[PDB]
Each structure stands twice: as C-alpha cells, then as structure tokens.
Symmetry: C2
Subunit: 82 residues, 2 copies
C-alpha cells in the first residue's frame, strides 16, 4: 500500500555454523520494487541469516509485509553429461 517505506537496498549475510556471519554481495537495490526476489544460483547450507536493510530513499521508516525462506531440507540431463 505504501512502498515509499520500502528499503533502498538490502544486504544479506549468511552463516552455516550460525556464528561466522559473512556477506554474500553488495546490497541489492530494492526501491520501487513490488516483489523482492533474490535468487541463489548455488543453494547454501544456512543456519543463520542477517538482513541489513538500508534506509529508504525518501522515507525514514520501513514498511514490510512478509518474509519467505525458500529452500530444501537434507531429504526433501546436464547433471549426468559431465
């Protein structure tokens, strides 16, 4: 409804062991985006994730609706050619 409060850029840091927190890339810009998709080409073994959301371009507040964490569990063509 009011995405003027959407963060300008978000920086994701992951932790397989849950303590060593390492960045993944430069903060991806998110201003003016209705649907935030961050694809991971390589599926990452993660126990802890830190989301550093930066201040919006023309706002001092953050308005958020839902966080989804899409992944696979341990037991939940090109792969043979090599």
């Amino acid at each position: 409804a009011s995405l003027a409060t959407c963060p300008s850029s978000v920086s994701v840091e992951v932790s397989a062991d849950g303590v060593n927190m390492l960045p993944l890339s430069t903060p991806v810009v998110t201003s003016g985006l209705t649907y935030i998709k961050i694809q991971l080409v390589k599926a990452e073994v993660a126990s802890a994730v830190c989301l550093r959301l930066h201040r919006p371009r023309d706002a001092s507040t953050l308005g958020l609706s839902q966080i989804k964490l899409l992944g696979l569990t341990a037991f939940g063509e090109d792969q043979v050619s090599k």
Copy 2:
C-alpha cells in the same frame, strides 16, 4: 498513493529558441521518490 509506477529516471531537455532541443545531464534516478526536485544551479531561459 501508488508510486510503484514512478519512472526510474527522467532526462530533461530544454530549448531557448524552442527548436534546438538539447539534454541537460544524465537521467537522474527517481524510483522510490515521493517528491521530485531538480535544482538548477544556473537559471535557464527556456521556451520548450
């Protein structure tokens, strides 16, 4: 109310004589801006 449709960048061109249309600068990004302000340091005599 719904600024998801706000343009990403605007490129302003002026014409003192109204025919020779020429750019002023690189398009300034504007996505996620509620108030679009372009300050002109040197005031410009523009007809178009």
